[PDB]
Amino acid sequence: VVIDDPPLRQTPEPFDEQSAYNPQSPIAIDFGSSKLRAGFVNHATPTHIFPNALTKFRDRKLNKNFTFVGNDTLLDQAVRSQSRSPFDGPFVTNWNLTEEILDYTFHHLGVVPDNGIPNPILLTERLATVQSQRTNWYQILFETYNVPGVTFGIDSLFSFYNYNPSGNKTGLVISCGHEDTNVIPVVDGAGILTDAKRINWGGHQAVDYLNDLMALKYPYFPTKMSYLQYETMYKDYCYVSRNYDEDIEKILTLENLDTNDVVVEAPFTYDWRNSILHLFLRGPRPHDSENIHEQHQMHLNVERIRVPEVIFQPTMGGQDQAGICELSETILLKKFGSQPGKLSQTSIDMVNNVLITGGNAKVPGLKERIVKEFTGFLPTGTNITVNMSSDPSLDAWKGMAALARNEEQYRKTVISKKEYEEYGPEYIKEHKLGNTKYFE
Amino acid sequence: RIKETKEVYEGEVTELTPEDAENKTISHVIVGLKSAKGTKTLRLDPTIYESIQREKVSIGDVIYIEANTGAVKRVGRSDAYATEFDLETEEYVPLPKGEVHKKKE
Amino acid sequence: ERLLFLRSVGERNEIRFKSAHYKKPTRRHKSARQLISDENKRINALLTKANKLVPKATYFSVEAPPSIRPAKKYCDVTGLKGFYKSPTNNIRYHNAEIYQLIVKPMAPGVDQEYLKLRGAN
Numbered sequence A: 001v002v003i004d005d006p007p008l009r010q011t012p013e014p015f016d017e018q019s020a021y022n023p024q025s026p027i028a029i030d031f032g033s034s035k036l037r038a039g040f041v042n043h044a045t046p047t048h049i050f051p052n053a054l055t056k057f058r059d060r061k062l063n064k065n066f067t068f069v070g071n072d073t074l075l076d077q078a079v080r081s082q083s084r085s086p087f088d089g090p091f092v093t094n095w096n097l098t099e100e101i102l103d104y105t106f107h108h109l110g111v112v113p114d115n116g117i118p119n120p121i122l123l124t125e126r127l128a129t130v131q132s133q134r135t136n137w138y139q140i141l142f143e144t145y146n147v148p149g150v151t152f153g154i155d156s157l158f159s160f161y162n163y164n165p166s167g168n169k170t171g172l173v174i175s176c177g178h179e180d181t182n183v184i185p186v187v188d189g190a191g192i193l194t195d196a197k198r199i200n201w202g203g204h205q206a207v208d209y210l211n212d213l214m215a216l217k218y219p220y221f222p223t224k225m226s227y228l229q230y231e232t233m234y235k236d237y238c239y240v241s242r243n244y245d246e247d248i249e250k251i252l253t254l255e256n257l258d259t260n261d262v263v264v265e266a267p268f269t270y271d272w273r274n275s276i277l278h279l280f281l282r283g284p285r286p287h288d289s290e291n292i293h294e295q296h297q298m299h300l301n302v303e304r305i306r307v308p309e310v311i312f313q314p315t316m317g318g319q320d321q322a323g324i325c326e327l328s329e330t331i332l333l334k335k336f337g338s339q340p341g342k343l344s345q346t347s348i349d350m351v352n353n354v355l356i357t358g359g360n361a362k363v364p365g366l367k368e369r370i371v372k373e374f375t376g377f378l379p380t381g382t383n384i385t386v387n388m389s390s391d392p393s394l395d396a397w398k399g400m401a402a403l404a405r406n407e408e409q410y411r412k413t414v415i416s417k418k419e420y421e422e423y424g425p426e427y428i429k430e431h432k433l434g435n436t437k438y439f440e
Numbered sequence B: 001r002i003k004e005t006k007e008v009y010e011g012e013v014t015e016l017t018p019e020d021a022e023n024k025t026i027s028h029v030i031v032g033l034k035s036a037k038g039t040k041t042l043r044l045d046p047t048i049y050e051s052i053q054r055e056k057v058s059i060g061d062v063i064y065i066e067a068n069t070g071a072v073k074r075v076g077r078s079d080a081y082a083t084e085f086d087l088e089t090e091e092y093v094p095l096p097k098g099e100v101h102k103k104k105e
Numbered sequence C: 001e002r003l004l005f006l007r008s009v010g011e012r013n014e015i016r017f018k019s020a021h022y023k024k025p026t027r028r029h030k031s032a033r034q035l036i037s038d039e040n041k042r043i044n045a046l047l048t049k050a051n052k053l054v055p056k057a058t059y060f061s062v063e064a065p066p067s068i069r070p071a072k073k074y075c076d077v078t079g080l081k082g083f084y085k086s087p088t089n090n091i092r093y094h095n096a097e098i099y100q101l102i103v104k105p106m107a108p109g110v111d112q113e114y115l116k117l118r119g120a121n
Helices: A077-082 A095-109 A131-143 A155-163 A203-217 A227-236 A276-282 A292-296 A324-334 A345-352 A366-377 A395-405 A407-413 A417-422 B046-053 C003-013 C032-051 C096-103 C110-118
Strands: A027-030 A037-040 A171-176 A181-187 A197-199 A263-265 A297-299 A354-357 A386-388 B006-019 B028-035 B038-044 B061-066 B072-078 B101-104
Touching: A027 A095, A027 A395, A037 A095, A037 A395, A095 A131, A131 A417, A131 C032, A155 A171, A155 A181, A155 A354, A155 A395, A171 A324, A171 A345, A181 A324, A181 A345, A197 A324, A203 A227, A203 C110, A276 C096, A292 A297, A324 A345, A324 A366, A345 A354, A354 A366, A366 A386, A366 B038, A395 A407, B006 B038, B006 B046, B028 B046, B028 B061, B038 B046, B046 B072
Parallel strands: A171 A354, A354 A386
Antiparallel strands: A027 A037, A171 A181, A181 A197, A263 A297, B006 B028, B006 B061, B006 B101, B028 B038, B061 B072
């Protein structure tokens, strides 16, 4: 019996400021999929990381309405519990709250304002964003703030630009993120969004799935654990099996039971081998209902594989869509000019360049899984090389930094306020790092 | 005493497309075979295509192809195609974990 | 007490970052599903105008289609192979003791939240 307590511990010093700055230098925000970070362009690493959450916290002895938005939630647990994200689903439903978030970020940057904003901005758009949300973002960043430089871009494609700085590389980009998982094919550094696909399942849905299975495994439990406790035991106690099918027969079981079968303990106050239900529920050791800790204890690992393995079979999550393997197979073989039987040359170098990223892809065992299934459907003898990032959430920020180092690419990606005033909000610059047109 | 080579193609029938090219009598057939180490594609004469038709082979079946003798033996439907119906007479067999093309002397 | 730390940091956050004469436009507040319906109506209006150019969309054409391979079946309560499904309950179950221990004495209304994981409720 090895027990783990899951309560969140965080009480840092307050986030701060950098007064020394250049007003003409661009600034980068990396919303992306994980919705967590920002920083100055000239630095190699992001300066600040925010939880993307807002707390209304009335202060006593002077009763006014107060915003405790952002990283202040990490300081106090009650302020953390009061917090909620601006995003409703795939997109933010609270635009003035986003304005408050952005102004908090600008103050934490340490810039001295000039008119609206004196500096160019780097912005990550969500893939294939809705036109009304495009207009909403335009009226956020240009009419409200008079900005010299505005860019639109996709975070996983920024990741591809980060690990392919030349900008003329074929490749296949997968992104497993907090909200959704997308597949995007890239040809000569220009991604094709007509052939791109995505699944609505994301990391947040995975933690919700774990919470649902956890509500089902013990309907009667003395303690209600928080969302972030579920997040911690998801990021610490879920790994990808090499293949689901044989590993669900022997569910780390018989001999491998009581070697890796971890029991999860709450924060505060006929044979056992014969019953399969008892082995699933209370583990290998005999259950003692009298112990208050063991009544508060909970046996996990029973299926810690199901939670990452929903992305390959999305019908387990209720969504009637194909998985990562099937979409990657039909992109690599059926589409992009490859007749069924050989890979086209673009498809060959797509196989040679495959990147796993997102920041929700830090679950162990994903690389070997995707390599084995890529070997499964491809012709024999084709070399498969899949590249993995050390911090997969951090790739898009370095990507827009590396584009900002590329002066002609940056000049081709800036939208200024005069174009938004003239062609209106229907128009977008067709970057290789941007969304295509809506119709046709 | 005779020396001999045995060449075996094995795996799941991914694709099966007979080209007729009438001038009834098919010209040839293209056959794709899938294993755990990858897949291949094969070009076959119409006689072994008819012998394939006499083992009731469809897409998803696992077959035995010998290069020289040209003998065909079906093994059963694939494990990935098990849940098309809840219970069916077709024997379900896993994929060959080796390569498709095996040779021995 | 306790309020000094939070009071001080909130003093640092709250006072510049805006253009002349702009404020909250008190716009209508909608949830996300509302935005999907309005966007769907928008390209619907565009295509009905075009019908009276080629059909293409962004948020709906990146939707992953359903798979052609039949998906693996799993038990609803345990998660192994669902060899069997109960006729009355429509619940996938693994074996006999699972059936008589969970599927039979299940308290009603739990079968829909069982199927809600697979979205068959």
